[PDB]
Amino acid sequence: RKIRKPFEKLSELEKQVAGTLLKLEDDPDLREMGLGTLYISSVKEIAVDGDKKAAVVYVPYPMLQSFQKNSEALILKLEKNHSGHRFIIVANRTIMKNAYVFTGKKSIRRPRSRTMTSVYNCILDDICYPIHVIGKRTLYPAGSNPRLQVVLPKAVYNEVSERTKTYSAVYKALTERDTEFIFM
RNA sequence: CGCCGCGUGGGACCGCGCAGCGGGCGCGGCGCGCCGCCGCCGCAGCCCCGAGGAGAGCGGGCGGGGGCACCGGUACCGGCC
Fold first, then answer.
1. Where are the domains of chain A?
2. Sign of torsion, CA A22 A28 A30 A32?
3. Can you say whether residue A34 is alpha, beta or left, with left for phi > 0 and alpha for psi between -120 and 50 degrees?
4. N or C: which terminus of chain A has fewer CB atoms within 10 Å of its end residue's CB?
5. Can you give the distance from the CA of residue A114 to the C1' of nucleotide B49 in angstroms?
6. Nearest-nucleotide field for A114 (CA, C1')
């Protein structure tokens, strides 16, 4: 019964992560808030560039903000329990296709947050929930292949210098764009 | 035969869509949709952003800008000693 945190039947990786989450409520290491009946949905095993492969943990969108109240406590604990992976929390928000859906009688329409442009920007924020993006210039270079550039404060740069490689490669998985990062 | 007709395709550009969905019942009078009815537990259910557009606000100075009342100063002209 590893069913207390995730959902359904999955591959080997998620069950071990579910175990860390079961002890995680038991350990009150700054994670008491929200945890106790906080549940997850899926994990993405993504091989990130040359860095240790960083896996993603899709967390249900209603329970995303409460889960990430102290996001640091989730990532550090997770790494110690399952070394080799820099885990990243992402809400499973969904893009709805068709801005208006016509049933003939009425056009039901799509909400704004369910669109690719709205979803992608919200994905970057989950990759760096503690650090707010200073700016997101896009470089469409001379030889084609647009690359997203993200600017963050230099104060947090020393910490996220190491974790930028896992973040850029995972966002390449979530979004086709060749995202790259820079600091002020 | 200019054909603003029609048929099929495309859907960038161009405008334009207020209403919640979805499941089941269900083969609703040869198949279906209606049309209901039940929270029925399946939806991240339901907000682009915030124009060196625009209106509104507060603050702080700005000016022979407008009105209205009051008024002072010589000068010109007139009447005096």
1. 1-184
2. positive
3. left
4. N
5. 15
6. B44
